[PDB]
Amino acid sequence: PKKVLTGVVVSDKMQKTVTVLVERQFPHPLYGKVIKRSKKYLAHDPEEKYKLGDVVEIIESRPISKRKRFRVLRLVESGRMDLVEKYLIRRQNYESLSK
Amino acid sequence: GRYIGPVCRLCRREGVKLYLKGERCYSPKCAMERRPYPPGQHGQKRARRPSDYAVRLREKQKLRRIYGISERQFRNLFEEASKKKGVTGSVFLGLLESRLDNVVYRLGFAVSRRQARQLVRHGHITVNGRRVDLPSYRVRPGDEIAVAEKSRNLELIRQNLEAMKGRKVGPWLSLDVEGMKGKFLRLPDREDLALPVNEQLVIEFYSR
Amino acid sequence: RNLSALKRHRQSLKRRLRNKAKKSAIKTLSKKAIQLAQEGKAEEALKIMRKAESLIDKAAKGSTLHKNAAARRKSRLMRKVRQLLEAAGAPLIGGGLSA
Amino acid sequence: MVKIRLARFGSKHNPHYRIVVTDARRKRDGKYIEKIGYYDPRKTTPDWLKVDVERARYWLSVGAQPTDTARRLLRQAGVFRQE
RNA sequence: UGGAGAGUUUGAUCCUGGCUCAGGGUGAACGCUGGCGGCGUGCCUAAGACAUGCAAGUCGUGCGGGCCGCGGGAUUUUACUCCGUGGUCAGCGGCGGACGGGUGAGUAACGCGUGGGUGACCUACCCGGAAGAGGGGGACAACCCGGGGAAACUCGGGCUAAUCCCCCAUGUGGACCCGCCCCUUGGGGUGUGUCCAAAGGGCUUUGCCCGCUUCCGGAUGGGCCCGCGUCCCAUCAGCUAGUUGGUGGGGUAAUGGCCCACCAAGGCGACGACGGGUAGCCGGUCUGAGAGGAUGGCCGGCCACAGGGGCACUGAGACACGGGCCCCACUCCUACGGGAGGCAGCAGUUAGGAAUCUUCCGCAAUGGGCGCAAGCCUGACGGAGCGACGCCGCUUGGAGGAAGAAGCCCUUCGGGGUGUAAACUCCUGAACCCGGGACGAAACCCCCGACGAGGGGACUGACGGUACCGGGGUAAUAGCGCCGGCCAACUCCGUGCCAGCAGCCGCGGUAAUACGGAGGGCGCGAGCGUUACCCGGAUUCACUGGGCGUAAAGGGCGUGUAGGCGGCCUGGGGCGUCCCAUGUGAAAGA
Ligand SMILES: [Mg+2]
Ligand SMILES: [Mg+2]
Ligand SMILES: [Mg+2]
Ligand SMILES: [Mg+2]
Ligand SMILES: [Mg+2]
Ligand SMILES: [Mg+2]
């Protein structure tokens, strides 16, 4: 069955496209503890419809670009800017890590 | 393979009578009557207090030296016995005891295991009628172990099979003396054997 | 040191040539048709399309252009032509279009 | 064109074939689509030929050609024998 | 059904802790030694270079010729010409050359593994089903006649067949545009319009066989995409312009910045981007009590490569190991203009190296390509050969045989040891000789039947005069390591911190069970040792299963970012977690 993934929209800065952060969590093969881990997907939003902070389902799809390979199936809930907030700060930590 | 050298000479060293000659090892020596001590220049100086290791060694030496099977072959049989279901110490005994060359001897067709082994190599033995020249051949229960009718003549087959006329035989064996043949009824139960040998120690020698 | 199936080469060359040839017609004729529609030509622009259509189908009879590379070409062409004609006036006479 | 054919198992001077459906192009002893029988030419056992005839009939139904010698064995187990 | 530890820091002790040994393994190599067989296995190094032979063809039942024959005819005049047939050689045309076989160079990646997606696709030959093949026309090799080149070869001119190419027809049908319906990514259905088929051959000749064409399905094989998984270095921290997305093209069988134009300004990264190193991945293999560690040779699956680098053509399929073009490096021929070539196919040579095989036999079997078949091709393969490289089986005798030869060794001079060992008696009879002698092979095919089912018949064995069976028959090979402790096995000489041993601890300075020899002893045995490498023990990277006051180890102290962790009660949800069913988990291996 075409994979269905649910995540948070963290970018509408592209035409007909959204970046979706999908968290995943599981037992660590050796050390046991349940650990989180995530991935951004670029998903197809043809009616520039879903916006920054929406939770969406993402569905395994016939390719649209190099790297566009999922389409936005539906919307789960609006608003969730905390999640976007989380991602953004984590992103800015990065400056405070080089030389 | 197989040993070939001085023998009622470990009837010695291993401390105890192995009948390896059999015929003589019954009568004023397995060499072991005249000198019940280890061989060589030192063999009757005061016994060294032997190590936990030494002990385990000699004991397996003893057991193996009884059936004159070689270390390689002995070891394979043991590993076979370990991985097999049931009490490994015993099973091993069952298995050594299933070697044709030993059974040929247990049935009395020969007076020793080394002599028995030759009768097997030289075509003098059958199993269920069909001929078999492998000492290592595994005898299973129900198998009939004949002298080869062609061999039934020789001064040896005569003498030994005659000698058996009076003789009693293994609870796990049967032997029709007249028709020069035996049956292998079941594999021997530890109790059926009277071996001068503590097998639990042998198992122990194959730990470390 | 003399493998007699370099005969395969000899034929390949002949075939290469026969193909090259068929395809050249197809291109130069399609060009011609869509050029004519770009100028709003009922009769003449379809008249030619109709030939090109045919010439393609024929090409797909054997090895040249087999398949539905055929089909692709036909589609692309009778889209192009059709649109270009309504992009000017004039609709009618003849042709391989379902009106 | 897929095939019912022989596939060599066993050992040296000890052939045992497996009767297998497989693509024509595939190596002799390679990956097959189904085992559907076996065959020991030296008949060393009572059990020297065996064929899943319902299965043989299916593959034939979908158009696999047996080797000449495969069909020999097939017939012998009565794949073709009718009414 | 599974888990052993020991030596070594001190005068002694307990503890930390490293080093070391005992076990298992190997595509090994090296030393001493070496009898037989079966089954495995054998360039780990230079993906260095390669002499020679062989490794892919086949079809005359698609077609027309050339050359060498033979035989019939027309004329009764011998020239000229028609027909039939046998060699043989290519050519046109098909199907195969994309499989099979080789290697691991590159590749850290959708390459591989595993589970999914394709409404985004392809599939020659095979099977099933529906419907067809009616007219015309053409050319290019062969062959013939010329020219250029040393050679490779090559340029022109003329003739000609076909299942070669084209045109018109028929349109079961299918393709495309537009519409409408169902369905939902480009999936079905339908209506105008347009467009698209074909090839003949054989005959046991009016009726069958091999083919051809369109289309719908099947089967097998493949492309593309996605989730998850997949080594070392952070003393590599920022990276990115087809870059990230878009709209429209192009290209493909098909999606896609795959490619292009135009617009937008984006994408990626401490959950490690980028960079560097190393590396084919897996099924498995070895080891371990297990968790784990290590590994990917043989066999099977996938990938990638074919002197190095580009690239396309042809085709169902290749961007093609034994096809093509160009650049480069090499070797060869050259009449100096130019040409030929590519063992990581089987053998084999040479180089490198500690080291790795026969220029064997056969298409008899299995499997593959073409063929209606007979058949042909097949260094795939089935065998044999070399190497104790590995595993397994077997031999070098068996029973007698002294209070116990000789020699050698010890000796408190009584004796003690090698030792039932030898001698010697009988017995058996590896080797070797004679006789017979396989299975592996019943199909294709032919006959009967009906070219079906079924029945009958014949041909065929490289291994091989081998295996195996019967008869005869000789007492017929033993080596290597070790004996201070760990670790099984002790004595005499020699030697004097020398010569030497040595895995660790340590032996040797004139009485050495530790060096060298000898007697004797322990261990294993056609082997035994050594070196290298992997796991073990090592709970010594500690998830299972470790630690940090003085043994190595708390950051000089705070603040608080990410992150990790989170009191008590109730309700929803059901992501984690748990349960049932089910699919998957190929074969090999276990
Ligand atoms: Mg010390
Ligand atoms: Mg100290
Ligand atoms: Mg000390
Ligand atoms: Mg220690
Ligand atoms: Mg510690
Ligand atoms: Mg400290």
Swiss-Prot record, chain A:
InterPro entries in the record: NA-bd_OB-fold (IPR012340), Ribosomal_uS17 (IPR000266), Ribosomal_uS17_bact/chlr (IPR019984), Ribosomal_uS17_CS (IPR019979)
Pfam name, any one: Ribosomal_S17
GO cellular component, one term: cytosolic small ribosomal subunit
GO MF terms held by the record: rRNA binding; structural constituent of ribosome
One BP term from GO: translation
Protein's UniProt keywords contain Ribonucleoprotein: yes
S-S pairs: none
Knockout mutant characteristics: Increased generation time and a temperature-sensitive phenotype.
Keyword tags: Ribonucleoprotein, Ribosomal protein, RNA-binding, rRNA-binding
Keyword Ribosomal protein applies: yes
HAMAP family: Ribosomal_uS17_B
Function: One of the primary rRNA binding proteins, it binds directly to 16S rRNA where it helps nucleate assembly of the platform and body of the 30S subunit by bringing together and stabilizing interactions between several different RNA helices. The combined cluster of proteins S8, S12 and S17 appears to hold together the shoulder and platform of the 30S subunit.
Assigned protein family: Belongs to the universal ribosomal protein uS17 family.
Assembly with partners or alone: Part of the 30S ribosomal subunit. Contacts protein S12.
Name of the protein described by the UniProt record: Small ribosomal subunit protein uS17
Swiss-Prot record, chain B:
Cofactor binding remark: Binds 1 zinc ion per subunit. In a number of structures (e.g. 4Y4O, 5FDV) a 4Fe-4S cluster is seen in place of the zinc cofactor.
InterPro entries xrefs: Ribosomal_uS4, Ribosomal_uS4_bac-type, Ribosomal_uS4_CS, Ribosomal_uS4_N, S4_RNA-bd, S4_RNA-bd_sf
Annotated SUPFAM superfamilies: Alpha-L RNA-binding motif
A single MF term (Gene Ontology): metal ion binding
Gene3D superfamilies named among the record's database cross-references: Ribosomal Protein S4 Delta 41, Chain A, domain 1, RNA-binding S4 domain
Pfam family, one: S4
Every S4 RNA-binding domain range: 98-160
The keyword GTP-binding appears for this protein: no
BP GO annotations: ribosomal small subunit biogenesis; translation
Signal peptide start and end residues: none
Keyword check for Ribonucleoprotein: yes
Gene Ontology CC: small ribosomal subunit
Keywords associated with the record: Metal-binding, Ribonucleoprotein, Ribosomal protein, RNA-binding, rRNA-binding, Zinc
Listed cofactors: Zn(2+); [4Fe-4S] cluster
Binding site for Zn(2+): 8, 11, 25, 30
Role: One of the primary rRNA binding proteins, it binds directly to 16S rRNA where it helps nucleate assembly of the body and platform of the 30S subunit. Binds mRNA in the 70S ribosome, positioning it for translation.
Family (UniProt): Belongs to the universal ribosomal protein uS4 family.
Record note on quaternary structure: Part of the 30S ribosomal subunit. Contacts protein S5. The interaction surface between S4 and S5 is involved in control of translational fidelity.
Official protein name in the record: Small ribosomal subunit protein uS4
Taxon lineage: Bacteria, Thermotogati, Deinococcota, Deinococci, Thermales
Gene name in the database record: rpsD
Swiss-Prot record, chain C:
Start and end residues of each stretch annotated as Disordered: 1-25
Keyword entries, A-Z: Ribonucleoprotein, Ribosomal protein, RNA-binding, rRNA-binding
GO function term, MF aspect, one: small ribosomal subunit rRNA binding
InterPro entries hit by this protein: Ribosomal_bS20, Ribosomal_bS20_sf
Record-level GO cellular component terms: small ribosomal subunit
GO biological process: translation
Family matches, as PANTHER family: 30S RIBOSOMAL PROTEIN S20, SMALL RIBOSOMAL SUBUNIT PROTEIN BS20C
UniProt similarity note: Belongs to the bacterial ribosomal protein bS20 family.
HAMAP family: Ribosomal_bS20 (MF_00500)
Function: One of the primary rRNA binding proteins, it binds directly to 16S rRNA where it nucleates assembly of the bottom of the body of the 30S subunit, by binding to several RNA helices of the 16S rRNA.
Subunit details: Part of the 30S ribosomal subunit.
NCBIfam families: S20
Name of the featured protein: Small ribosomal subunit protein bS20
UniProtKB/Swiss-Prot annotation, chain D:
Role: Binds to the lower part of the body of the 30S subunit, where it stabilizes two of its domains.
Family: Belongs to the bacterial ribosomal protein bS16 family.
Stored Pfam families: Ribosomal_S16 (PF00886)
Lineage: Bacteria, Thermotogati, Deinococcota, Deinococci, Thermales
GO molecular function: structural constituent of ribosome
Organism: Thermus thermophilus (strain ATCC 27634 / DSM 579 / HB8)
UniProt superkingdom: Bacteria
Cellular component GO terms, alphabetical: cytoplasm; small ribosomal subunit
PANTHER family per UniProt: 30S RIBOSOMAL PROTEIN S16, SMALL RIBOSOMAL SUBUNIT PROTEIN BS16M
Gene3D superfamilies noted in UniProt: 3.30.1320.10
Entry keyword set: Ribonucleoprotein, Ribosomal protein
Subunit (UniProt): Part of the 30S ribosomal subunit.
GO terms (BP aspect): translation
InterPro entries per UniProt: Ribosomal_bS16 (IPR000307), Ribosomal_bS16_dom_sf (IPR023803)
Coiled-coil regions listed: none
Protein name: Small ribosomal subunit protein bS16
Gene name of the encoded protein: rpsP
Signal peptide region: none
